[PDB]
Each structure stands twice: as C-alpha cells, then as structure tokens.
Amino acid sequence: SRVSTRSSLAEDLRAIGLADGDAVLVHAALRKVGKIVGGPDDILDAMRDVIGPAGTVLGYADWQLEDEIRDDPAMREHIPAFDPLRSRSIRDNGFWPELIRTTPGALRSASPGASMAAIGGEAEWFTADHALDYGYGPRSPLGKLVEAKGKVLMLGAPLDTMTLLHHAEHLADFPNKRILRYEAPILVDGEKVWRWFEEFDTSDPPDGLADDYFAGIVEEFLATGRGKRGKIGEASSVLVPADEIVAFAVDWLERWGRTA
Amino acid sequence: RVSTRSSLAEDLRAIGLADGDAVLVHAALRKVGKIVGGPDDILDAMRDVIGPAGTVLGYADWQLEDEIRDDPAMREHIPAFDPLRSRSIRDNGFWPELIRTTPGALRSASPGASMAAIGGEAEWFTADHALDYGYGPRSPLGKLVEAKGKVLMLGAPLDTMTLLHHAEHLADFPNKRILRYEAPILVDGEKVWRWFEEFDTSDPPDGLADDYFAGIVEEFLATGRGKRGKIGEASSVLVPADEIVAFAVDWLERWGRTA
Ligand SMILES: CC(C)(COP(=O)(O)OP(=O)(O)OC[C@H]1O[C@@H](n2cnc3c(N)ncnc32)[C@H](O)[C@@H]1OP(=O)(O)O)[C@@H](O)C(=O)NCCC(=O)NCCS
Ligand SMILES: CC(C)(COP(=O)(O)OP(=O)(O)OC[C@H]1O[C@@H](n2cnc3c(N)ncnc32)[C@H](O)[C@@H]1OP(=O)(O)O)[C@@H](O)C(=O)NCCC(=O)NCCS
C-alpha cells in the first residue's frame, strides 16, 4: 500500500543492478508494481534516468494476427500486412511492449512474430536487420543483446516468459528440433505480399519438457548466485546478465538432449 | 459475424459519412464485435470513407485523478501534461489512445479538454486550444461546429457526447457552476503548476441528472435530423455537430427561463 514515484523507481532499479549505459530487455506484469503516481510511464522514465540516454530499453512486441489465415482462408485479402510502424503489439505480452512502442523516439524490429520494440541510444542498432527467418537467432535483437552484454529484467512477470531463452534453443545442439512453417502478410517495396516463414518453434516446448520449463532454468541459474533479485515498486523482480544465461541455458539444453 | 476494413467502410457509408467530413467519435469498441485486423480497421475504414482531407477526432483528456488534490506531498511527483507523451484517460476507452498513438496524429494543449485528431485538418483542430474554458469557441469542439462536422456514437452510451458541454458553455442560463483547479503543464518546456478555470463538465447544472445529455440526443433524434445504424455489431448514431449544439443550446436556455 506504498506508492511509487519516478524517483522511487530509479532507486529500486539501481538496487537491482541496472546501471549507466546498458541495454535491458524487460518483461513485466505491471499490476505487480502496485500504485504509481504517474502510471507505468514513470517506470520507463525511471529506467532511462538510471541507464542514461545511451542505454536502451527493450520490450517484446510480437504481433497481433491470431493465426487467422490458418483459422480461415478466404479471410486472406482482409488481413492487413505486418507494419512495424503501425502493427500493434500482441496483447498476451501485456501493456509493457506497447508502452514502449508508442513512446516517442521508439523503434520496432522487422521480423513480425519475433519483433521487438526498443527505445534509447542504440535502439536503431537493435531493431536493424532482424532476420525474417529464424528471427530468434544471431541476427535479432536477442542475439545483439548477448553481444552487447545486455541484461534481462523480469519485472514481476512469470519466469517462463524470458524470451531470450528461445535464442538459446536456436543455438543449442540437441536432437529433433521442431520446425515451424507458416505464411504471413508483410510489406515488400511498399506493398502487401504474402510470404513463407521458417523458424524453430517457440510456441511449444520441445520433446515433452513442460510449457514452463524456461522457469526452472532461470531458477537454477539464479541459484548459482550470478543473477540478482529485488523489488521494483511492489513487484518481485529478477535482473540477469543476457550472455551468461544464454550460455547457461544452451548447456542445460545440450545436456538434456544427450541425456535424452 | 466478422467485420473488415471493407465491411466497416460500407456501414460507415450507410450511416452517413462522406468525403471531407470532420467527425468526433465516441466509442464502446467491444460491441462492434469481432474485427479481423483489430479496431485499427475502424479508423482505417473511416479514413477511406472521409478521405485524406477529412478528419477523425477522439476525446483524450488525461490521467490526473486530482492526485494533486488526492494527496499533496505527491504534488511534486506528478509529471506535467505533455501533449505528446500524456496518455488519454482510460474512462474514455481505447478509441482516443488508438487515434493518439497512430502515426501522424496530433493532440491539443488544454489538458482536461484535450482532443486527439488525425487527418487533413488535424493541425487546425488541435491548434490554439484555450487553456481556460477549453470547451468554448477556441477549442476543437468549437471548430467542429465552424466546420459543420459530425459526432458518431460508435456503440457508446449517449450521454458521453462531449460536444454538448460546448453547448453548456454557449448557452445563457443562470448560475453556471464555475470550476477552479490547479494543474501541472509545460511552460518553457519546464513543469509549472497553473490555476485553471472552466464551466463545470464533471457535474450537471443544479437541476438536471448526470446523464441528461442522453435525453437531449434522443429528442434531437426524434426530430428526424439524425441517423441511426449499425457499425459492425454496434448500434450507432451520427449527428451534425452544428445542429445538435443549436438544438441543445435552446433546450438549455428554455429551461433556465423557468425562473
Ligand atoms: C500476462 C501479464 C502480461 C499480465 O499482466 P498484468 O499484470 O495483468 O498487467 P499488464 O502488464 O497487462 O498491465 C496491466 C496494468 O497496466 C496498466 N495500464 C494499462 N494500460 C494503461 C494505460 N493505458 N495507461 C496507464 N496504465 C495502463 C494498468 O495499471 C493495468 O492495470 P489495470 O488493469 O488494473 O488497469 C503478465 O502475467 C505477464 O505474463 N507478463 C509477461 C508477459 C511477457 O512478457 N510475455 C513475453 C512472451 S511469453
Ligand atoms: C467506457 C467504455 C469505453 C467501455 O466500453 P468497452 O466496450 O470496454 O470499449 P473499449 O473502447 O474500452 O474497448 C474494448 C476493446 O478493446 C479492443 N482493444 C483495446 N485495446 C486494444 C488493443 N491495444 N489492440 C486491439 N484491441 C484493443 C478489444 O476489443 C477490447 O476489449 P477486450 O477486453 O474484449 O479485448 C464505453 O462504455 C464508453 O462509455 N465509451 C465512450 C467513452 C466516451 O467517449 N466518453 C466521453 C466523455 S464522457
């Protein structure tokens, strides 16, 4: 029953381990933060204060389509193509990625289901050259987050929502990786075109692992004492080094596959 | 039954939008039912019908809650109203945010009377919005009448026709409740608290119920100069701005003469 301020939130974020200049991909359950004087926008502004204008805040936008094509052909000519400036974020990811995407100055990646919204000094870099096929691999904001030794913050969100770990699935050498194939409308030369996509499946867990297996891995990684826990506002949170948990999750997966 | 950009276009043409129209829209998006490309299809269908020269509006207002007055000793943690950054009030539903967050959209200065606009004259409608008395003649509402614009209640309840607050402003009747409040805005790009004054829009004139706007709109429809119809699955009405205000002003002025 405490209220948070732009000012109060900056202190929590510094305590959790966020500092000057780094890139943080944020997953959030905003109601967990409790009351905020200026709403959730106070959070983004708190963050940007802490990391400074060279830091970058990321969100997982995804897109809103709903497999409508598969749900209904002959609904095909009525589906607006994916437009990184105009396609609104998937609602399942909560308000946060839409908060960012609609904040002035923000930018948004090209690969439609894997699309990220970013804001700050390197927003351009992170949203540039997002590959259309295998958009969870090396040529994506996720792969870039690893190269820049960025961070992931679970802002009250459930721990099996850490999208970064899909990058690990892509990288890890294990047997029988499911492949997803689907066709979706996008823009080519200013016009709407339908295009066939190819990627590892991220919508389903592989080989009988539970749907929430991402959570156990984050949990395990935190036990090693190289993550950090803390409260932001009223929300229990987790801040984690991007490159250290990817490499960690790749070994978890690589062993599980062998072990079978 | 599903709606599309094409489908919504024909419903919008059926109700009476045309090339060049200005339209202030109030909406209850949920009863439009299922739309293929989301509610953005409504805005996209509207713009098709009215064209690049037509303009669509939404009532943005802002998220303050008298927090200022809810608890000073938070006074200072209250960000100023920024027409480019302040989200619209959630009581007005998604529609105004939808417009506001569409690229090319614009917003005016008067925080509580703040309007979102998009299209050919969006610059004109949002410009020079008076801080004091933001529902008078130098507001987007006043310009709507000057432009012979329209109001579309998209499934919305009828007493949410903000345009009629403009009539309250214009109409001469006794004992209008004047309202004074203090609010943080940007002066010189810096937060500065400022005392406002408006006629009250939060409570009716002493007398009428809080929803009397609904009575008036229904009586204007009885005259036969409105038009009723279905946009998607939402029961809707479309009225001329100029005519509804004129109507409402007389209704108001007549009632005050019962002195
Ligand atoms: C599903 C999930 C999003 C649920 O979130 P939630 O806690 O219900 O809340 P949300 O983040 O959607 O945000 C809700 C709060 O946003 C705030 N909010 C929403 N819109 C707002 C607005 N326009 N203006 C101001 N505040 C707003 C409100 O406080 C809202 O609460 P309310 O519903 O009481 O108003 C959360 O459980 C979760 O899974 N988060 C992580 C999801 C994710 O990142 N997924 C990645 C892929 S798996
Ligand atoms: C209050 C009021 C808005 C509630 O109506 P509502 O049916 O909840 O309508 P909303 O406009 O909030 O839209 C809800 C629909 O949003 C769509 N929506 C909201 N955000 C969306 C988004 N980001 N992307 C896609 N769809 C979204 C969904 O259909 C959503 O409902 P869901 O929860 O079923 O998904 C309505 O009764 C009303 O009075 N509207 C007029 C308000 C007004 O103009 N007031 C003027 C001043 S008095």
Author numbering:
A (entry chain B): 3 to 262
B (entry chain A): 4 to 262
What do the paper's sentences say?
The fold typical of the Antibiotic_NAT family is evident in all structures, composed of 13 α-helices and 8 β-strands, and determined structures superpose with pairwise RMSD’s 0.8–1.0 Å between 197 to 266 matching Cα atoms.
Group 3 enzymes including AAC(3)-IIIb and four meta-AACs confer resistance to 4,6- and 4,5-disubstituted AGs, consistent with previous data reported for AAC(3)-III enzymes; meta-AAC0038 is the lone member of this family that confers resistance to apramycin. The meta-AAC0038 adopts a dimeric structure with a buried surface of ~900 Å2 per subunit. This enzyme also forms a dimer in solution according to the size exclusion chromatography (not shown). Similar sequence signatures (residues Thr165-Glu171 in meta-AAC0038) were identified in all analyzed members of this family, with His and Glu (His168 and Glu171 in meta-AAC0038) along with two glycine residues (Gly122 and Gly158 in metaAAC0038), completely conserved. The meta-AAC0038 and AAC(3)-IIIb structures superimpose with RMSD 0.54 Å across 219 Cα atoms, share all the minor subdomain structural elements, and show complete conservation of AG binding residues. However, the position corresponding to Glu223 in AAC(3)-IIIb is occupied by Asp213 in meta-AAC0038.
